[PDB]
């Protein structure tokens, strides 16, 4: 369940268009060095990004290892070619190694983007988990747990605002503002309900309303998500 193939296919025309070809050479060896340097620089960012990423770590690391391997093959081919730029065979072995390298790069970007989107959607879970703390909290905790929520919510308000402006369909714009508006009110109703349970721990309905209101919080988080991934 990864399916990077379909995106990889769409970009393949671009990779192939740019890898089209429109004694020992010294000026060819510096170009070769440049590529090796560019390879190492790209490898350095990909390792950093695969490390910090909270999603697809093992997949992303594999993607960088693939890029490295293709880099070495490209390195070796470009070194052989620079030794004698007259040969078409070593020219072609380099060009093919290059096309393979950039395709491994392209696949890495595709994975990296898939993790960008999972990092983005995590905000929904972070806020939902923040309202679990509000629900499961003395009066001192409630005030505190509601401080954490509002902070996470503001960081969620940024994403959801950018997503609601990006919506083209007017009917979908309303859905986003509705679900995001629904989470806002029920979050406060959660605070009121959690408060009403501290003061009356033995009233079954206080617990029943708190559990209910939290379900209402679920429905908006999911509604915000469904309006985003559509």
């Amino acid at each position: 369940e990864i399916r990077t193939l379909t995106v990889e296919r769409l970009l393949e025309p671009l990779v192939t268009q740019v890898t089209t070809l429109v004694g020992r050479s010294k000026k060819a060896h510096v170009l070769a060095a440049s590529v090796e340097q560019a390879t190492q620089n790209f490898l350095e960012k990909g390792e950093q990004i695969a490390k910090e990423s909270q999603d697809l770590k093992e997949e992303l690391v594999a993607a960088v290892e693939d890029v490295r391997k293709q880099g070495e093959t490209m390195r070796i081919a470009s070194s052989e070619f620079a030794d004698d730029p007259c040969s078409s065979v070593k020219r072609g072995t380099m060009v093919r190694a290059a096309r393979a390298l950039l395709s491994a790069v392209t696949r890495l970007l595709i994975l990296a983007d898939m993790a960008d989107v999972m990092r983005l959607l995590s905000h929904l879970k972070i806020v939902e988990e923040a309202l679990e703390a509000v629900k499961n909290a003395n009066e001192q905790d409630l005030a505190n747990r509601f401080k954490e929520f509002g902070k996470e919510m503001v960081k969620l308000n940024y994403v959801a605002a950018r997503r609601q402006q990006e919506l083209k369909d007017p009917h979908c714009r309303d859905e986003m503002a509705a679900a995001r508006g629904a989470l806002k009110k029920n979050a406060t109703m959660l605070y009121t309900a959690s408060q009403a349970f501290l003061r009356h721990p033995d009233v079954a309905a206080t617990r029943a309303n708190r559990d209910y209101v939290f379900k209402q919080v679920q429905e908006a988080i999911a509604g915000i998500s469904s309006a985003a991934q559509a």
Binding site: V7, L10, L11, L14, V18, T19, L21, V22, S25, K27, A28, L31, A32, S34, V35, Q37, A38, T39, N41, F42, E44, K45, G46, I49, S53, M74, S78, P85, M94, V95, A98, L101, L102, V105, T106, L108, L109, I110, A112, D113, M114, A115, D116, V117, R119, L120, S122, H123, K155, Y158, V159, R162, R163, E166, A228, Q229, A230
Partner: protein, 56 residues
């Protein structure tokens, strides 16, 4: 999937082949995305390859 999968091609395409030209996936403005962080070292690599491949 959804809108984020259907636009994945254009985001990658924009970062590696910007000259061949879209929802954002940035969670806060103080943190650039993986694709944004990888865009420039990706472009430099391709420019380096093009120069090499087209040596005369």
């Amino acid at each position: 999937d959804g809108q984020y999968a259907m636009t994945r091609a254009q985001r990658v395409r924009a970062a590696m082949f910007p000259e061949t030209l879209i929802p954002s996936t940035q969670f806060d403005a103080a943190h650039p995305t993986n694709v944004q962080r990888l865009a420039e070292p990706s472009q430099m690599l391709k420019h380096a390859v093009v120069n090499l491949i087209n040596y005369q």
